[PDB]
Ligand binder design. Structure first.
Ligand SMILES: Cc1cc2nc3c(=O)[nH]c(=O)nc-3n(C[C@H](O)[C@H](O)[C@H](O)COP(=O)(O)O)c2cc1C
Ligand SMILES: [Cl-]
Ligand SMILES: [Co+2]
Ligand SMILES: [Mg+2]
Length: 116
């Protein structure tokens, strides 16, 4: 598929998605009109490890890059493992301007090892 990614605007409330790539539409099954303006957490669901979600929340707070592997769900409810790479984007003034999150679909690290 084409690269899956979204770009959020942390200068707006709760880091809304302001751009979603064609690859993200394909991976997630959502239309661009269903995605724009919401927070990336909408892909989570019952099996998502809340401890991983907290690591993401702390990375966003600290404006630090992180990679995690977590369960996400397509529009039709299909589970997928998401190796999610989040990167803060700063402008030439040193100010946070975006986050970008790149999704790679696959159980890259086996779940028995992820669990620790
Ligand atoms: C650019 C960007 C992309 C994100 N993409 C995803 C994603 O693909 N899947 C997901 O589960 N969370 C994704 N998130 C994480 C959530 O948006 C959120 O930061 C996380 O769930 C932690 O915050 P919370 O505890 O308030 O939900 C993304 C966040 C950012 C900033
Ligand atoms: Cl966020
Ligand atoms: Co591809
Ligand atoms: Mg939550």
């Amino acid at each position: 598929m084409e690269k899956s990614f979204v770009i959020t605007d942390p200068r707006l409330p709760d880091n809304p998605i302001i751009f979603a790539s064609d690859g993200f539409l394909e991976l997630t099954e959502y239309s661009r009109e269903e995605i724009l303006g919401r927070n990336g957490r909408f892909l989570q669901g019952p099996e998502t490890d809340q401890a991983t979600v907290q690591k993401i929340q702390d990375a966003i707070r600290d404006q630090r890059e992180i990679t995690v592997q977590l369960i996400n769900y397509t529009k039709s409810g299909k589970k997928f493992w998401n190796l999610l790479h989040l990167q803060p984007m700063r402008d030439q003034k040193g100010e946070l301007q975006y986050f970008i999150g790149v999704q790679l679909d696959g159980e890259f690290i086996p779940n028995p090892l992820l669990g620790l």
